[PDB]
């Protein structure tokens, strides 16, 4: 009726809850974590604790830090810096602590802007068409890899039948889940998401043959002009021919 969690099991559930708060996973497993916290960490593990840990890691990052994401100028092995491997067992993520520049990498979004007007556009869109204000397409034919740097993280780019690795200045991780690309979201006086991320796709695999990305390409717009435009698109990566 009751379950006791080991060091590794509790750490992975801790990481899973942190990942759920980052809005990277849709599920978590948090059974035995209260006692795992009160047994190893010594403090309560409510939503306030986690929010503060996320805040301190991704912002106000100042000095060394242990695997539990606690800083200070069992768990008494504080390492220098560079990265953290947030692995829950079901989903792994390579997260980067704050650097002097993370601040301006980070857009706010707590209040999204207006829906930009709509324009009729083609959905039969191949990869070499790059006239977006929101997109950027790079092809490395030398390593047969496709990188899709995005410049507007708020516009969503839902993948389909695809297996990608997305890079960013906050956290790099791999996605195979079909649907919207899941981006980290930090809460500190509001919701902060990264300014831009890159999506690398290995063409020379066999895993992304039937990969299709559906997004909203933004094109520039008288009587006041300056209208922003939006049109749906089906970007295919199919290396069939």
């Amino acid at each position, epitope marked *: *009726m*009751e*379950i*006791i969690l*080991t*060091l*590794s099991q509790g750490l992975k559930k801790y990481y899973g809850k942190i990942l759920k708060l980052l809005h990277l996973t849709l599920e978590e497993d948090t059974e035995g974590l209260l*006692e795992w916290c*009160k*047994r*190893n*960490l*010594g*403090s309560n593990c409510d939503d306030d604790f986690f929010q503060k840990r996320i805040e301190e890691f991704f912002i106000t990052g100042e000095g060394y830090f242990n695997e539990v994401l606690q800083f200070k100028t*069992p768990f008494k092995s504080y390492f220098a810096k560079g990265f953290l491997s947030i692995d829950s067992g079901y989903f792994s993520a390579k997260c980067y602590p704050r650097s002097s520049t993370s601040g301006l990498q980070l857009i706010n979004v707590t209040q999204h802007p207006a829906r930009i007007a709509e324009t009729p556009g083609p959905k039969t869109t191949s990869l070499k068409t790059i006239n977006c204000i929101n997109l950027r397409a790079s092809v490395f034919k030398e390593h047969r890899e496709v990188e899709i740097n995005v410049l507007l993280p708020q516009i969503a780019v839902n993948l389909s039948n695809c297996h990608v690795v997305i890079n960013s200045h906050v956290c790099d991780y791999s996605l195979d889940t079909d649907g919207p690309v899941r981006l980290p979201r930090i809460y500190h006086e509001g919701t902060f998401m990264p300014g831009t991320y890159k999506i690398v796709i290995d063409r020379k695999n066999k895993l992304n043959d039937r990969c299709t990305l559906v997004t909203n390409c933004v094109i520039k717009g008288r009587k006041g002009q300056s209208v922003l435009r939006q049109y749906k698109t089906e970007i295919k990566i199919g290396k069939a021919p």
Partner: antibody, heavy 105, light 107 residues
């Protein structure tokens, strides 16, 4: 370094250790007849967990000291103090004091 | 609530013989640990996390098993090994012990 506990009589307890700031401390008893009942643990931060069979009738340092109602004769036992070594396998109580025999009469 | 049944309860072995004793859980556990108690004194930790010997424990001792069923084996019976051996398991919360195995030397 080994741990040493304070024998006694009660009607119908101290463990001396040698750090309470780093380690959980456990209680163990042996009813006469070589048996064993797990009773509880106090971790370094002071949170507690109890065996539900004790019905919340029972536990609470600054100088390396650990401190212990409606007593029954079934509770006559040798009492052991013990401590967890955290790792990738838990519990693993490796040092035990000698115990104190309690007779309920 | 999670009963641990160890078998045999009583066993004897001639010196230098290989022995083995089992511990059975009503529900499966991740690992089993075993403690050695010798009559009239404090219990000693003997094997933890299924098969790791505590420091000082001679290499003639070993542990094995998985799921519900775990074992303790002695490659050479020694005179100092007469004693009661108790299993206890993790993933309970009501942590529970087995009843012990008393090992006599058949001299």
């Amino acid at each position: 370094v080994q741990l040493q506990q304070s024998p006694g009589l009660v009607a119908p307890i101290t463990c001396t250790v040698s750090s309470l700031t780093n380690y959980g401390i456990h209680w163990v008893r042996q009813p006469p007849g070589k048996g064993l009942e797990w009773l509880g643990v106090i971790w370094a931060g002071g949170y507690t967990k109890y065996n539900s069979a004790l019905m919340s009738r029972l536990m609470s340092n600054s100088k390396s000291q650990v401190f212990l109602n409606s007593l029954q004769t079934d509770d006559t036992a040798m009492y052991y103090c013990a401590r967890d070594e955290v790792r990738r396998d838990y519990y693993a109580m490796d040092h035990w004091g000698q115990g104190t025999t309690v007779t309920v009469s | 609530d999670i009963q641990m049944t160890q078998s045999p309860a009583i066993l004897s072995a001639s010196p230098g013989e290989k022995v083995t004793m089992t511990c059975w859980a009503s529900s499966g556990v991740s690992y089993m640990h075993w403690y050695q108690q010798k009559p009239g004194s404090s219990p000693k930790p003997w094997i933890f996390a299924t098969s790791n010997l505590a420091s000082g424990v001679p290499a003639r001792f070993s542990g094995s098993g998985s799921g519900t069923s775990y074992s303790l084996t002695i490659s050479r019976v020694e005179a100092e090994d007469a004693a009661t051996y108790y299993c206890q398991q993790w993933s309970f919360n009501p942590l529970t012990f087995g009843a012990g195995t008393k090992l006599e030397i058949k001299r």
